[PDB]
Amino acid sequence: DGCCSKMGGINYCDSSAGRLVCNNGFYSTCYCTRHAVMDLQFLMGCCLWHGGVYPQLNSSGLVVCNDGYVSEECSLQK
Amino acid sequence: YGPNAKSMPTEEGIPPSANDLLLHVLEGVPPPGSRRLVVSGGDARAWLSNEKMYVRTNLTILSPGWLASMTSADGTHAYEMQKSPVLLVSWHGKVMQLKVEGL
Amino acid sequence: MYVRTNLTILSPGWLASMTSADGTHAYEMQKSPVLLVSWHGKVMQLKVEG
Amino acid sequence: KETALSVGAQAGLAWRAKIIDEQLNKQARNLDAIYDFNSLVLEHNILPPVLLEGRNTLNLADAQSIRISDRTYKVAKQAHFITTPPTWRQYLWMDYVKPEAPNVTLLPKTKAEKEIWCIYTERGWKNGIDQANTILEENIARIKEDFGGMILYRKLLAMNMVSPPYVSHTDLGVTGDGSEIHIDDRVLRITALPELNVNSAEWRAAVAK
Amino acid sequence: KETALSVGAQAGLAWRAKIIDEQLNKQARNLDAIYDFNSLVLEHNILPPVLLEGRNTLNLADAQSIRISDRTYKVAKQAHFITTPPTWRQYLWMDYVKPEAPNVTLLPKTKAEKEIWCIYTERGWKNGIDQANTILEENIARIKEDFGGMILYRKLLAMNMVSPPYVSHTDLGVTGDGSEIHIDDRVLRITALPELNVNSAEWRAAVAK
Amino acid sequence: MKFKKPPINNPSDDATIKLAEAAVSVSDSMLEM
Amino acid sequence: AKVEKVITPPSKDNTLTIPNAYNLQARASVDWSGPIEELTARIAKAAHFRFRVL
Amino acid sequence: AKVEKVITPPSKDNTLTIPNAYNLQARASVDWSGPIEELTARIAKAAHFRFRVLGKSPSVPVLISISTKDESLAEILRDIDYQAGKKASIHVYPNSQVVELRYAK
Amino acid sequence: VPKLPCRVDGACDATIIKMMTDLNKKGIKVASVGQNYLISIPASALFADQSPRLNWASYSLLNEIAAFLKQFRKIAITVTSYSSKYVSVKRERALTLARSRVVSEYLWSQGVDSRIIFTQGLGSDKPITSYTLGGDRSPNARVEITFRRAV
């Protein structure tokens, strides 16, 4: 939990790098701005690699992405 | 051309140059009437005005394919693109994924 | 230069193109002494004097 | 009990989708290693078109009506421009939203109800696994077909079966009004789509050693 | 809970606005030190026009249709006179009205409600801080864009790509009736706005050592 | 042997940071003109 | 690859325009999937050579 | 890609080689995007060389664009030759210190 | 945001500090300046006597230095080797190059988080100590590994 553990502590959140500054002059392992380098390799959501979900709602759960492509896995079944 | 004419002749002209909003985009001023998009994962800003994404970064875009792009004097990149929630970038030979909420 | 035919040019690229329903084409271009026109799968070269 | 079947289907499908997504992420370098479209992008950043072939065609139209052919070819998707190369993640990634809302309506009070609840959930688990596998197989078939189409286009291009796409370009100077200016208006235009030649005598064969 | 989110957003927004206004005051000399609009005025007390540039322009207009150019230049704001030079205070100052009436009708009753009320107010506080930073970033981008536009106009005027403004002034001596008199009347007007040229022959270049 | 680095100061602020980010670009552009 | 190799005979090799000299016998391994410019700049920095763009 | 790639031998290369006279060994930070004639004339005057032309400019002159900070003017002329290509030629005479711009027809 | 990782995965600055202290009391040089880092290793704990062969207990130290390298994000790492003048110049040049090549191959086979590895072996052309009395025990024969930590 302690970002600058075994160090002095937190000085300030440098928002240019999005990183905390420890009392010793070393960048901590923590993050302090969401605009930092995230190595995202896995996500959530559905109708991905498309236009996302359609804004409309159906009586069913038949969700067709905004590219015009149907998403049966995201939709319900029988 | 008579009032009962079968067909007007089909035209063909010079395709348009670009969109001038990208200059404001690369300068950082959002275009008027647009709303902001929350981006998390890298270093970019994004707006939505006319059902098309407008982003500003220094990175390079891969996945959805952009409609038009502009390059700054110092190399800052601005992109006009079809709408999508996900982006794929190459940073320094390493690939990475970016997500956009609030579409 | 303005060229009127029923064919399609290949080499210079038009600056403004027009066509009709029955197949008549007209092209406006910068002046060039040579042209390339493809017709029905075979590509021919044309010389024009100006 | 039907609710138990449905939530078993949903939970098994979601779990299998998550496992197959991380397994697809495990071998990420090999995917773009083998499916390199960037090698096959043409010189004017134009995607080469898609060709399909068939061999030993026979059709019986009705009685006393038989039509046969040796091979055939078909253009599937016409060639067009591409700003960026495609990737396999446009073909193979699975959507994942785990549903976690089983409404508290029927919950098994007898041990027999618990056991049939378990086997109904198990059946739904099997069904969701099967559905995820079929979806994966469908996507694999699609991307295999498109990659085979591009490599087939290059093959019969070498065999001299397609006219290569002829594209001109008009180059201008500066342009605009007194207020706005451009520098060098270059407009590119493909006036010749690729198509098959039908004069077969010009076809070029091949030999090996 | 939505009330907790709203009051957290309002309180964080107001507090961060007050802090950033104090820090903006703390560097008062440096702001108008680096944004010298007063040096940038032309000799007839006239604000220079604003210009924008763009490099390596391409566009796919539709399928089979692309147009490229090296650079473009666009007039952003037309040249006009100014009584006084502008400063940063009409660009970067935050409007600060301290709220004092948090209406608390909904109230937590137990410890769980109190704790989630605390964390929801914390979330709203964070969101208000982010909104304040967003507003500041947009403002500084706007003023930097305008300043860069004026220095770009000076750049291209030194490059001989635009035309300087042309201004006439007509002078009359003693004027007015027997009841009111103006002893002189110098009236001036700009006869031509500055604008780019399309003739390439009048273009100078630059070198360094 | 507790390690450190020389330059340490009082804690900074993001508004000042992005003001510097604008300022350096303004400085170099006007320097070249 | 077999059919295109047999239909078009080879003519040249890039080793004519690419010779080899000293401080080029270093070894490397890589995983790069981006533009060419940073990669070429890094390899020039390894080579301690001048870098030129055209 | 190996068997399909097309190259040229360096003996037949149509590129401007380095003239390496002493007056060409300076640094210059130049950004430009426009015509050619004033650029090469002003380069020659910065190098203290004379300058002349032969041929004629066409209806649309050749447009070039170069941005750099710290690189020799000989390399500037080399990149000018590479941007021009076929319709334009550039010669440097160091005996009588002149530069020559040649058009095509 | 709960899906957002709060830290870079598999990282703890306390562990970084602790293993740095363990290396420095183990007797191998750790150098930190700016965002750049350099590690210096004596050859006597690594190879045989002027020989491009690996002692079997050195896999522990190589795993330890791999575990240290697993705690940063980097682009390019350069390794280099130095020796003493033994018979020729060419002999120890090729020896240092082969030593650097082998250790580079093993550290690549260990899953280091990097993009580019550079191998350099020079020999006895750039020593750092005039006192060259010892042989392979002398610290001028060495291996360094250096990089810059980006962001």
| Alpha-carbon separation of residue E200 from D173, D174, E64, H33, H63 (angstroms) | 10, 8, 31, 11, 10
Query: How far is it, in rounded angstroms, from Cα E57 to Cα B78?
Result: 11
Cross-strand bridge partners of residue H51: H99
Residue whose tokens read 């390439």: E200
Which experimental technique did the depositors report for determining this structure?
A: cryo-EM
Contact by Cβ (8 Å): B39, B59 = no
The CA distance from E62 to the nearest CA of chain B, in Å, is 8
Provide φ and ψ at C16, rounded to 5°. -155, 135
Task: Number of D to G CB contacts under 8 A, please give it.
Answer: 17
> Is the C-alpha dihedral spanning G52, G53, H2, H8 positive or negative?
negative
Query: How far is it, in rounded angstroms, from Cα H54 to Cα E208?
Result: 28
Structure tokens at G23: 């401080």
Nearest CA in chain A to F12: A12
Query: Is the CB of E144 less than 8 angstroms away from the CB of B27?
Result: yes
Identity of the residue in A42, A48, A77 whose CB atom sits nearest the CB atom of D95? A48
DSSP states of D56-122: EEEEEEETTEEEEEEEEEEEEE--EE-SS---THHHHPPP--------SS----SHHHHHHHHHHHH
Identity of the residue in B60, B91, B93 whose CB atom sits nearest the CB atom of G31? B93
Closest CA to D163 of D202, D135, D208: D202
Query: How far is it, in rounded angstroms, from Cα B8 to Cα C18?
Result: 11
The CA distance from E2 to the nearest CA of chain B, in Å, is 19
Contact by Cβ (8 Å): H45, H38 = no
Residue whose tokens read 């404001």: B24
Cross-strand bridge partners of residue I100: none
Structure tokens at C48: 């024009």
Closest CA to E72 of E92, E88, E51: E51
Query: How far is it, in rounded angstroms, from Cα A26 to Cα A24?
Result: 6
Identity of the residue in G5, G17, G54 whose CB atom sits nearest the CB atom of H79? G54
| Interface list for chain D against chain C, based on CB atoms closer than 8 Å | 163, 166, 168-170, 187, 189, 191-192, 195, 197-199
Query: How far is it, in rounded angstroms, from Cα E25 to Cα E93?
Result: 9
Query: Is the CB of D166 less than 8 angstroms away from the CB of C38?
Result: yes
The CA distance from I64 to the nearest CA of chain F, in Å, is 20
> Is the C-alpha dihedral spanning G8, G12, G17, G22 positive or negative?
positive
Query: How far is it, in rounded angstroms, from Cα C6 to Cα C19?
Result: 9
Angle subtended at Cα H39 by Cα H35 and Cα H43, rounded to the nearest 5 degrees: 170
Contact by Cβ (8 Å): H46, H72 = no
Q: DSSP alpha helices (H): ranges in chain B?
A: 21-27
Angle subtended at Cα A16 by Cα A11 and Cα A22, rounded to the nearest 5 degrees: 20
Closest CA to E85 of E118, E39, E141, E130: E39
Which chain D residues are closer than 8 Å to A41 by Cβ? 25, 28
Instruction: Tell me the residue type at H84.
Output: A
Closest CA to D93 of D15, D13, D18, D11: D18
DSSP, res D196: B
Closest CA to A73 of E17, D133, E171: D133
Distance of CA E48 to the CA centre of its chain: 15
Query: How far is it, in rounded angstroms, from Cα F26 to Cα F28?
Result: 6
| Alpha-carbon separation of residue D160 from D147, D157, D163, D198 (angstroms) | 20, 5, 8, 11
The CA distance from E204 to the nearest CA of chain H, in Å, is 7
Angle subtended at Cα D91 by Cα D88 and Cα D95, rounded to the nearest 5 degrees: 115
| Alpha-carbon separation of residue E177 from B79, E170, E171, I30 (angstroms) | 64, 20, 18, 93
Contact by Cβ (8 Å): D32, G33 = yes
The CA distance from G18 to the nearest CA of chain H, in Å, is 10
Structure tokens at D91: 């073909």
CA dihedral E40, D175, E193, E147 (to 10 degrees): -20
Query: How far is it, in rounded angstroms, from Cα E171 to Cα E173?
Result: 7
Cross-strand bridge partners of residue A54: none
Residue whose tokens read 């005051």: E25
Query: How far is it, in rounded angstroms, from Cα H72 to Cα H27?
Result: 5
DSSP states of G1-54: -HHHHHHS-----TTTT----TT----EEE---S-SHHHHHHHHHHHT------
Residue whose tokens read 């500003």: B56
Q: What is the CB neighbour count within 10 angstroms for residue A65?
A: 19
Closest CA to F18 of I75, G21, E23: E23
**Exposed, middle or buried by CB within 10 Å (0-12, 13-18, 19+), for B90?**
middle
Contact by Cβ (8 Å): B78, B56 = yes
Residue A40, chain B, CB below 8 Å: the answer is yes
Residue of E50, E59, E68 best to disrupt the D interface, most CBs of D under 10 A: E68
Angle subtended at Cα A39 by Cα I101 and Cα I115, rounded to the nearest 5 degrees: 15
Contact by Cβ (8 Å): B100, B39 = yes
Strands H64-71 and H28-34: antiparallel
Contact by Cβ (8 Å): I39, I65 = yes
Give the helix/strand (H/E) hosting B98: strand B95-101
Query: How far is it, in rounded angstroms, from Cα I40 to Cα H84?
Result: 52
Structure tokens at I94: 């090729």
Identity of the residue in G4, G31, G33 whose CB atom sits nearest the CB atom of D158? G4
Residue whose tokens read 């190399």: B75
Nearest CA in chain H to G2: H3
Query: Is the CB of D189 less than 8 angstroms away from the CB of E65?
Result: yes
Identity of the residue in D29, D158, D209 whose CB atom sits nearest the CB atom of G3? D158
Contact by Cβ (8 Å): A20, A35 = no
Query: Is the CB of I8 less than 8 angstroms away from the CB of A29?
Result: yes
Contact by Cβ (8 Å): I81, I97 = yes
Nearest CA in chain F to E155: F33
| Alpha-carbon separation of residue H71 from B44, H76, H77, H97 (angstroms) | 33, 7, 11, 21
Nearest CA in chain G to H15: G54
Find the length of chain I: 151
Query: How far is it, in rounded angstroms, from Cα F26 to Cα E151?
Result: 9
Query: How far is it, in rounded angstroms, from Cα E44 to Cα E27?
Result: 31
Cβ within 8 Å of residue I2, ≥6 positions away: none
Query: How far is it, in rounded angstroms, from Cα E2 to Cα D190?
Result: 58
Contact by Cβ (8 Å): H14, E190 = no
Q: What is the CB neighbour count within 10 angstroms for residue E136?
A: 20
Contact by Cβ (8 Å): C46, C39 = no
Query: Is the CB of C41 less than 8 angstroms away from the CB of D199?
Result: yes
Query: Is the CB of C18 less than 8 angstroms away from the CB of B12?
Result: yes
Which three-class secondary structure state does DSSP give residue H24? helix
In our burial notation (b when 16+ CB lie closer than 10 A, e otherwise), range F9-30 reads eeebebbeebbeebbeeeeebe
Which chain B residues are closer than 8 Å to A40 by Cβ? 41, 96-99
Query: Angle E2-26/E111-159 helices, nearest 10 degrees?
Result: 40
Contact by Cβ (8 Å): D189, C13 = yes
**Exposed, middle or buried by CB within 10 Å (0-12, 13-18, 19+), for G3?**
middle
Cβ within 8 Å of residue D58, ≥6 positions away: D66, D67, D68
Which three-class secondary structure state does DSSP give residue D204? coil
The CA distance from F32 to the nearest CA of chain A, in Å, is 25
Query: Is the CB of I119 less than 8 angstroms away from the CB of G28?
Result: yes
Q: What is the CB neighbour count within 10 angstroms for residue G17?
A: 12
> Is the C-alpha dihedral spanning D17, D18, D19, D20 positive or negative?
positive
The CA distance from C20 to the nearest CA of chain D, in Å, is 17
Longest CA–CA separation in chain F, Å: 50
Residue E42, chain F, CB below 8 Å: the answer is no
Residue I87, chain B, CB below 8 Å: the answer is no
Identity of the residue in B63, B96, B103 whose CB atom sits nearest the CB atom of A39? B96
Closest CA to E133 of A20, F22, B23, F13: F13
Angle subtended at Cα G41 by Cα G38 and Cα G42, rounded to the nearest 5 degrees: 85
The resolution in Å comes to: 4.6
Contact by Cβ (8 Å): E124, E8 = yes
Q: What is the CB neighbour count within 10 angstroms for residue I144?
A: 18
Identity of the residue in C8, C13, C41 whose CB atom sits nearest the CB atom of D169? C13
| Alpha-carbon separation of residue C11 from C44, D162, D168, E90 (angstroms) | 11, 19, 6, 57
Cβ within 8 Å of residue G46, ≥6 positions away: G26, G28, I78, I118
Instruction: Tell me the residue type at H22.
Output: Y
Query: How far is it, in rounded angstroms, from Cα C17 to Cα D170?
Result: 13
Identity of the residue in B14, B15, B62 whose CB atom sits nearest the CB atom of D84? B62
Query: Angle D111-158/D2-26 helices, nearest 10 degrees?
Result: 40
Query: Is the CB of F16 less than 8 angstroms away from the CB of E144?
Result: no
Strands E46-47 and B44-48: unpaired
Which chain I residues are closer than 8 Å to A6 by Cβ? 13-14, 17-18
Query: How far is it, in rounded angstroms, from Cα E159 to Cα E155?
Result: 6
Query: How far is it, in rounded angstroms, from Cα I10 to Cα I72?
Result: 10
Q: What is the CB neighbour count within 10 angstroms for residue A42?
A: 11
Chains B and D touch (3+ CB pairs under 8 A): yes
Structure tokens at F1: 């042997």
Contact by Cβ (8 Å): H105, H55 = yes
Which chain B residues are closer than 8 Å to A49 by Cβ? 63, 86
Residue whose tokens read 């007509």: E170
Contact by Cβ (8 Å): A18, B40 = no
Cβ within 8 Å of residue A4, ≥6 positions away: A10, A20, A22, A23, A24, A28, I13
Chain D residues 5-34 with a CB less than 8 Å from chain E: none
> Which chains reach chain I with 3 or more Cβ–Cβ distances below 8 angstroms?
A, B, F, G
Which chain H residues are closer than 8 Å to E209 by Cβ? 26-28
Instruction: Tell me the residue type at D147.
Output: F
Contact by Cβ (8 Å): E172, E158 = no
Chains C and I touch (3+ CB pairs under 8 A): no
Which chain D residues are closer than 8 Å to A53 by Cβ? none
The CA distance from F16 to the nearest CA of chain A, in Å, is 10
Residue whose tokens read 């580079």: I104
Instruction: Tell me the residue type at H75.
Output: E
Distance of CA H19 to the CA centre of its chain: 12
Query: How far is it, in rounded angstroms, from Cα A57 to Cα A64?
Result: 10
Query: How far is it, in rounded angstroms, from Cα H34 to Cα E204?
Result: 10
Structure tokens at H43: 């380069």
Structure tokens at C38: 């493809």
Nearest CA in chain E to H72: E209
Strands D80-81 and E46-47: unpaired
Nearest CA in chain A to F14: A15
Strands H50-54 and H98-103: parallel
Structure tokens at E175: 């004027």
Chain I residues 2-21 with a CB less than 8 Å from chain B: 4
Which three-class secondary structure state does DSSP give residue I123? strand
| Alpha-carbon separation of residue E150 from A72, E156, F33 (angstroms) | 55, 10, 12
Instruction: Tell me the residue type at E166.
Output: Y
Provide φ and ψ at H56, rounded to 5°. -155, 145
Contact by Cβ (8 Å): H89, H16 = no
With helix as H, strand as E and coil as C, how does chain E read?
CHHHHHHHHHHHHHHHHHHHHHHHHHCHHHHHHHCCCHHHCCCCCEECCEEEEEEEEEEEEECCEEEEEEEEEEEEECCEECCCCCCCHHHHCCCCCCCCCCCCCCCCCCHHHHHHHHHHHHHHHHHHHHHHHHHHHHHHHHHHHHHHHHHHHHHHHHHCCECCCEEEEEEECCECCCCCCECCEEEEEEEECCCECCCHHHCCCCCCC
Give the helix/strand (H/E) hosting C27: strand C25-28
Q: What is the CB neighbour count within 10 angstroms for residue E107?
A: 9
If you compute the radius of gyration of chain B from its CA atoms, what whole number of angstroms results?
Answer: 18
Contact by Cβ (8 Å): E117, E104 = no
Angle subtended at Cα E101 by Cα E96 and Cα E103, rounded to the nearest 5 degrees: 135
Angle subtended at Cα E163 by Cα E158 and Cα E165, rounded to the nearest 5 degrees: 110
Residue of D169, D190, D191 best to disrupt the C interface, most CBs of C under 10 A: D191
Which chain B residues are closer than 8 Å to G33 by Cβ? 90, 93-95
With helix as H, strand as E and coil as C, how does chain A read?
CCCCCCCCCEEEEECCCCEEEECCCCECCECCCCCCCCCECCCCCCCCCCCCCCCCCCCCCCCECCCCCECCCCCCCC
Query: How far is it, in rounded angstroms, from Cα D178 to Cα E73?
Result: 11
Cβ within 8 Å of residue E83, ≥6 positions away: E45
Cβ within 8 Å of residue I19, ≥6 positions away: I64, I67, I68
Chains C and G touch (3+ CB pairs under 8 A): no
Provide φ and ψ at C39, rounded to 5°. -145, 120
Which three-class secondary structure state does DSSP give residue C24? coil
CA dihedral I101, I107, I110, I112 (to 10 degrees): -130
DSSP states of B27-52: HTPPPTT-EEEEEESSSEEEEESSSE
**Exposed, middle or buried by CB within 10 Å (0-12, 13-18, 19+), for I91?**
middle
Structure tokens at G37: 């410019």
Query: How far is it, in rounded angstroms, from Cα B84 to Cα A66?
Result: 9
Query: How far is it, in rounded angstroms, from Cα D40 to Cα D38?
Result: 5
Query: Is the CB of B9 less than 8 angstroms away from the CB of C19?
Result: yes
Query: How far is it, in rounded angstroms, from Cα I51 to Cα B79?
Result: 56
With helix as H, strand as E and coil as C, how does E22-36 read?
HHHHHCHHHHHHHCC
Longest CA–CA separation in chain I, Å: 63
